[PDB]
Amino acid sequence: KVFGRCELAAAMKRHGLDNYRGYSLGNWVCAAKFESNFNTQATNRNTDGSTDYGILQINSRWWCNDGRTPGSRNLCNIPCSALLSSDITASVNCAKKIVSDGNGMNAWVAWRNRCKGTDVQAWIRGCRL
Ligand SMILES: [Cl-]
Ligand SMILES: [Cl-]
């Protein structure tokens, strides 16, 4: 599923992400835009052989099992394929574990490089939430 901007903001707001660990909703929408272009089916292979999955590009070397990332951890206890659902619940629940692990949203390279320190509230402006 390719989300609309406001559609995803509402969905994320309705999975508890607004101000989760202090990150306002716009941060999450911004990260999703640049990680996956709002596409729940996005996958990208990393040089170390891991793969990033889903609208927040959650990485198989730590967070999900895809059966092909040797010696990886599955800190979220999900198959990575669960992260490609049109239902973002699994991605959101796993993202909450990631953002809580000490490095905040800096775990998302696109967030640090394209969202951090920008006017992220612009990503939810015009949405009725
Ligand atoms: Cl915001
Ligand atoms: Cl933080």
UniProtKB/Swiss-Prot annotation:
Pfam families, alphabetized: Lys
Matches recorded under SMART domains: LYZ1
Domain of life: Eukaryota
Catalytically driven reaction(s): Hydrolysis of (1->4)-beta-linkages between N-acetylmuramic acid and N-acetyl-D-glucosamine residues in a peptidoglycan and between N-acetyl-D-glucosamine residues in chitodextrins
Residue pairs linked by disulfide bridges in the UniProt entry: C6-C127, C30-C115, C64-C80, C76-C94
Tissue localization of expression: In the egg white and polymorphonuclear leukocytes.
Keyword check for Protein biosynthesis: no
EC class of the enzyme, as a word: hydrolase
Keywords: Allergen, Antimicrobial, Bacteriolytic enzyme, Disulfide bond, Glycosidase, Hydrolase, Secreted, Signal
GO cellular component, one term: extracellular space
Residues forming the catalytic site: E35, D52
Residues reported in the UniProt entry to bind substrate: D101
Function, as annotated: Lysozymes have primarily a bacteriolytic function; those in tissues and body fluids are associated with the monocyte-macrophage system and enhance the activity of immunoagents. Has bacteriolytic activity against M.luteus.
Any further remark recorded for this protein: Lysozyme C is capable of both hydrolysis and transglycosylation; it also shows a slight esterase activity. It acts rapidly on both peptide-substituted and unsubstituted peptidoglycan, and slowly on chitin oligosaccharides.
This protein's name: Lysozyme C
Organism: Gallus gallus (Chicken)
Origin organism lineage: Eukaryota, Metazoa, Chordata, Craniata, Vertebrata
